Each structure stands twice: as structure tokens, then as C-alpha cells.
Amino acid sequence: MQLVLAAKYIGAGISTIGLLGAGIGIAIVFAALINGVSRNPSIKDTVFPMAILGFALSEATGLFCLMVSFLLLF
Amino acid sequence: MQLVLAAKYIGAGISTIGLLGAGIGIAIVFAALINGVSRNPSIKDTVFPMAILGFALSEATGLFCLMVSFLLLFG
Amino acid sequence: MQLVLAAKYIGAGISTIGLLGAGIGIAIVFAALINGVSRNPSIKDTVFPMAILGFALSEATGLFCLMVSFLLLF
Amino acid sequence: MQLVLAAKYIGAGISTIGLLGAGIGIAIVFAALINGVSRNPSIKDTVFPMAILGFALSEATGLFCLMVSFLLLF
Amino acid sequence: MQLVLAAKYIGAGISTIGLLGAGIGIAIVFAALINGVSRNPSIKDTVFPMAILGFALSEATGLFCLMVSFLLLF
Amino acid sequence: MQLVLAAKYIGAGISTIGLLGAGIGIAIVFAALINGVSRNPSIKDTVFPMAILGFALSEATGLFCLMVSFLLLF
Amino acid sequence: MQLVLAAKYIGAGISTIGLLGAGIGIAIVFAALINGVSRNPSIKDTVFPMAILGFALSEATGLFCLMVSFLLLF
Amino acid sequence: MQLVLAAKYIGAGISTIGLLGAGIGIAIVFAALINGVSRNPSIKDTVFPMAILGFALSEATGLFCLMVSFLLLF
Amino acid sequence: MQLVLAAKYIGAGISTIGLLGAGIGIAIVFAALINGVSRNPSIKDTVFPMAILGFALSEATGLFCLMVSFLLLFG
Amino acid sequence: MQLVLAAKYIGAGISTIGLLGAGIGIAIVFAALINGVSRNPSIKDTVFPMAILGFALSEATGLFCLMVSFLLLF
């Protein structure tokens, strides 16, 4: 039991590493948004929803990691 | 069996690392979509389905990682 | 209990790795803000709130990592 | 026998890390497709098959990782 | 007690890895500042406070990592 | 013998990590092909064999990794 | 006591990994300086102090890693 | 002897990780070749041998990794 | 003492990983030098010493890693 | 003795990881060379020696890693 519980807690920590992808990815989306709007302000209403979609889908990958983390913790 | 169970849980955690690739990749596809549309608004309806296809193929690599994770946790 | 405690401490250290994502991502958002404003100063009031949202969402991924770190430590 | 089985499951998990390469690579290919079509719409029919080939070859590297994973798992 | 002490020291070392994110991110912010000012010198007074804010927020992520490191050490 | 067998399986898993390099690299080559052809369609027949060569050489690095993996497995 | 000393030396080694962030970040800052001066030589006196500040702040993150390393070593 | 052999196998797997550098690097060289030729077709005979040298030198680093892998296996 | 010696050698190996940062950083500085000079040849004598300073500061981070490596191997 | 020798061989494998930096760095230098020459062929005699210097210094970091690897192996 002790070794199993120890493994769950180590595993839970490892399972958060993948969240770095969402941290970087969300930023990449918002950087494109800002750069696109600066170059062409008239396009903002068109590209803003694309940025929200892009962020949500990138974020979902990190939430999958967190899902595994919480299964191991709890 | 305690060693094997321990290994399943460590392995499950390690199996999620590869999801960082889809996290970054999905973002890269959507950034190109945004920059392409900002440069040439008329192209939107042509490139939007390319972005959907690209996101889905990138995401699938992460879903393979997650599949292995769930197999280790539950299988 | 000592083995479980050892694992909680190792797990907590591992759980901070993912914060590198927010470190880089917050920077990527601010770089875009700066480059966008330099190229088109008149867009500043439009893109500044986009940068704030972008950084907040990227930071949230790192805060998720830190939450797991603190759950393991406490 | 338990040490060997433990090794197989740890090894299977490690074998999925390389899939991050295909996750990023497939995206890089599709980003180029989108940017190329945006800059020169007439080139679409020419560059689309290149993107399909690029994606397939990048994905193949991740499929090799997953092959090793399943060999270790089963 | 030896096991717990060992884990604190390994955990503390691991807890510093995330600082690479701030190392890179702080640089990305200042690179943007330099490139933006080189392209449009008149914008310097507007973008400089943005760079200070961006640096501070990226640096904070590395400080959270170091916080965990010091908690494990002391 | 259990220890050696265990190490072969963990080593085999570790040996696949390097394949992420080819995953990314193959994509970088094809992205360049797409962007170069979009900018200058007349150059397609000249640069296509360059892309095939570049892909093959990047892929070779991942094949060396997989070679070690199979040696450890079999 | 030997397990604890072993942990300190393993931990000290791990504590240097984060220095890669400063290695890359310092370079990113100097790359921007060089490119900015090349594009607009007259801006040299303005951007050079920015590069010095950027380098110092990026390097500081690596110095924090090295601090933990030496704490663990000695 | 079994513990030493186990370590040689684990070490051999670890020694292939660095090949990811050549996987990416060879691609970066070929991407430049393709983009350079697309922008200036007349430069092809000048930059092609530069690409060959570039790829050879990047590949050498991966071959150094593979050498250590083979010394550990043999 | 065998455990401690073992740890010194593993730690020494791990201490070299950070050198990848200087490997990449030195390259980034020289790439900027090359691209800057290609775009504006007259600037060469101004930016060359900036590249030397930049390379040296990036390299020093790797030399800190190596210092820890040697301390673990020999100290 | 057995555990010490095992540690040397694992350490030797780990010591090659850092060579990925030189694999990528050497390529980055040669990519700049190729792109610079394509944009401005007349500059080739000036920038070629800069590329050789840049490659040598990037390569030196990997040779430092290899140095440690061979000390551990032999």
C-alpha cells in the first residue's frame, strides 16, 4: 500500500509537466491575435473568435493532463 | 503486485508528457490561421477548414498518449 | 509513512516544471504587445486588453501546476 | 517477474514522449500550408499534396514510438 | 528520516528546472523592446513600461519555482 | 536476469525519445518547401528533390534511435 | 547519512539544468541588439543599455539555480 | 556483473536522446537551403555546398551520441 | 561510500545537460551577426564586438554547469 | 565497485544529452549563412568566416559534454 500511494503522488507530479504545452500554446495564439490586429485593425472581429477557439483547444490538452493528475491524487 | 501497481501509476503520469506537443501544435495552427486571415481576409473560408484538419491531426498525437495513460490506469 | 512523505516532496518538486510554460508564454504575449504597438502606435488601447487576457490564460496553466505542488506539500 | 512487468509499464509510458515531435511537426506543416495559401491563393492545389505528404511523414515518427509502447504494453 | 531528507534535497534541485522558463521569457520581452525601439524610436516611452511589466510577470513564474525549492530546503 | 531484462525494456522506451527530433525536423523541411513554392511557384522542380533529401537525412537520425530500441528489445 | 549525501550530489547536478534558460535568453537579447543596430545604426546608444538590462535579468534566473546547486554541494 | 550490464543498457538508451539535435538541425539547414533558393534561384550552386557542410557538421553531433551508445552496448 | 561515489558520477553527467543552452545561444548570437552584416555590410565593425560579448556571456552559463560537473568528478 | 561502475555508465549516457544543443546550434549558424548569402551574394566572403567561428564555438559546448562522457567511460 505504501509504495503504491508513493507512486500515485510521484505520478501526479509528473502528470503536470504536459501543462507547459498549453502555457506556451495559449500565448502563441494570443501573440498572433495581437500581431494580426496591429497589422490590420479592421480584421479584429473576424480573428478574435478564432483566437478564443484556438486557446480553448490548446488549453484542453493541459486539462487532459490535469485530469490524470487529479485521478492519481484523489 | 505492489511494484507492478506502482509502475502502472508512474507510467500513467509519464504518458501525459507527450500532450505538450498537441498543446503547442494546436496553437501553431491557429496562429497561422489568424495571421493568414489578417494578411488576406478574403481567404478565410478557404483556410478555416485547413486549420480544423490541422488541429485534429495534431490533437490525435496527444490522444494516443492519453490512450496509453488510460490503459495503464484502468486496463 | 516516511516513504509516502518522501514521494510527496519529490512530486512537489516535479510539479513546478510545468511553470516554465507560463514563464515563456507570458513573455511571448508581451513581446507581441510591444512589437504590435511599435508598428502601429494607434492600436495600443485595442491590443493592451488582449495582452492582459492572453497573459492571464497562459499564467493559469502554471497556477494549475503550483496548485498540485501545494496539494502535495499540504 | 514483477520487476520485469514493472519495467514494461514504465517503458511503455516513456515510449509515448516522442509523440510530442509529431504533435508539433504536423502543426508546423499545416501552418505553412495556411500561410502559403493566404499569400498566394492560386498555389493551393500545388501545396496541399505537399502538406499531406509532410504530415504523413512527421506522423510516422510518432507511430514508431507508439509501436514500441504497444510492444512493451502487450 | 534519511529517506525524507533525501527527497527534500532531490525535490529542491528538481524545483529549479522551471526557472529556465523565466530565463528565456525575460529575454523574449527585452528582445521585443529592442526590436520595437529600433524600428520606431519615438515609441520608446510607451513600450518601456510594457517591457517592465512583462519581465516582472514572467519572472514571477520562476519565483514560484524558487519558493517551492526554498520550502523543501528549509 | 530480471534486472537486465528490466533495463532492456526501460532502455528501449528511453531510446524512442530522440524520434521527436525527426518528427519536428521532417515538418520543418516540408514547411520550407510549401513556403518557398508559394513565394516562387516556378522553383518547385528545383526545390522538391532538396526537400526529399532533407527529409531523408533528418529521418535517418530517428531511425538510428529506433535501431537502438530494437536492439534492446530483441 | 550516505543516502542524504548521495541525494545532495544528485540534487546539485539537477539544479544546474535551469542554466540552459539563461544560456539561450542571454543570446536572444544579444541577437536583438545586433539586428536592431544593423537595421538602424543611429539607435545603438539607446538599445545597448536595454541589452545590458535584459542580459542581467535573464542571467539572474541562472544564478538562482546555481545558488541552490552550491547550497546542496556544500 | 548483472547490475553493470543493466546500467550499460539503460545508458545506451539515454545516449540516443541527443540525436534529436541532429534531427532538428539537419532540417533547419535544409529549410534555409530551400528558402534561399526560392528567393534567389541563381544562388543554388553557391549555397548547396554550404548546406552539405552544415548538415554534415550537425549530423556529427548525433553520431557522437550514437558512438557512446555503441560503446556501452559493445 | 559506494552510494555517495555513485551519486557523484550520476550528478556529474546530469550537470552537463545545461550546456545545451550555451550550444544553442552561441549559435543564435552568431546567426544574428551574419544576418545583420548581410543586411547592412557597413555595420560589421560595430556589431562584431557585440557578438563576441554576447557569445562570452552565453558561454559562461555553460561553464558554470561544467564547473559543478568537475566539482562532482574531482572535488 | 559494481554500483560505482554502473553509475559511471549511466552518467556517461546522460552526459551526451547536452550534445543536442550543438546539433541545433551548428544548424542555426549555417541557416543564417545560407539565408544571408541568398539575400546578398556579395557578402559571402565576409560572413563565411563568421559562420566557421560560430559553428566552432557552438560545437565546443558539445565537446565539453563528450569530454565528461569519456572520463566516465574510460
- Flag if I21 and G16 touch (Cβ within 8 Å): no
Domain B2-75, architecture per CATH: Up-down Bundle (1.20)
Phi, psi of G49 (to 5 degrees): -65, -30
Residue J61, min C-alpha distance to chain H (Å): 11
The answer for residues whose C-beta is within 8 angstroms of residue I69's C-beta and 6 or more apart is: G13, G16, I12, I13, I15, I16, J68
CATH number of H2-74: 1.20.20.10
**C-alpha cell of C15?**
510539479
F66 touches chain H (CB under 8 A): no
- Flag if H10 and F12 touch (Cβ within 8 Å): no
Gyration radius from chain F CA atoms: 18
Gyration radius from chain H CA atoms: 18
Residue I21, min C-alpha distance to chain J (Å): 6
Residue A2, min C-alpha distance to chain B (Å): 9
- Flag if I2 and J6 touch (Cβ within 8 Å): no
Residue I13, min C-alpha distance to chain J (Å): 4
Sign of the dihedral through C-alpha I22, F20, I14, H11: negative
Distance CA E65, CA E28 (A): 19
CB burial string E33-69: b at 16+ within 10 A, e below: bbbbbbebeebbeebeebbebbbebbbbbbebbbebb
Kind and range of the H or E element at A52?
Answer: helix A44-73
DSSP chain I: -HHHHHHHHHHHHHTTTTHHHHHHHHHHHHHHHHHHHHH-GGGHHHHHHHHHHHHHHHHHHHHHHHHHHHHHHH-
J71 touches chain H (CB under 8 A): no
The answer for residues whose C-beta is within 8 angstroms of residue C22's C-beta and 6 or more apart is: A23, C58, C59, C61, C62, C63, E21, E61
The answer for residues whose C-beta is within 8 angstroms of residue I8's C-beta and 6 or more apart is: G9, I72, I73
Alpha-helix residue ranges (DSSP H) falling in B1-75 = 2-14, 19-39, 44-74
Of C37, C59, C62, Cβ closest to residue E46: C37
Residue I40, min C-alpha distance to chain J (Å): 10
- Comparing C-alpha atoms, which of I4, J69, D32, E46 is closest to residue C33? E46
H63 touches chain J (CB under 8 A): no
Distance CA H29, CA J27 (A): 5
Contacts of H24 in chain J (CB under 8 A): 23-24, 27
Which residue of chain I comes nearest to J1, CA vs CA? I2
Sign of the dihedral through C-alpha F30, F36, F39, F45: negative
DSSP G17-38: TTHHHHHHHHHHHHHHHHHHHH
Distances in whole angstroms, Cα of residue C73 to Cα of each of C5, C6, C66, D4, E71: 9, 10, 10, 32, 9
Say if CB H42 and CB F40 are below 8 A apart. no
Three-state DSSP class for F61? helix
Q: What technique solved it?
A: X-ray
Q: What is the resolution of this structure in A?
A: 2.0
User: Domain locations in chain F?
Assistant: 2-74
- In chain A, which among 31-60 make CB contacts under 8 A with chain C? 31-35, 37-39, 41, 44, 55, 59
**C-alpha cell of J25?**
546550434
Which residue of chain J comes nearest to I59, CA vs CA? J61
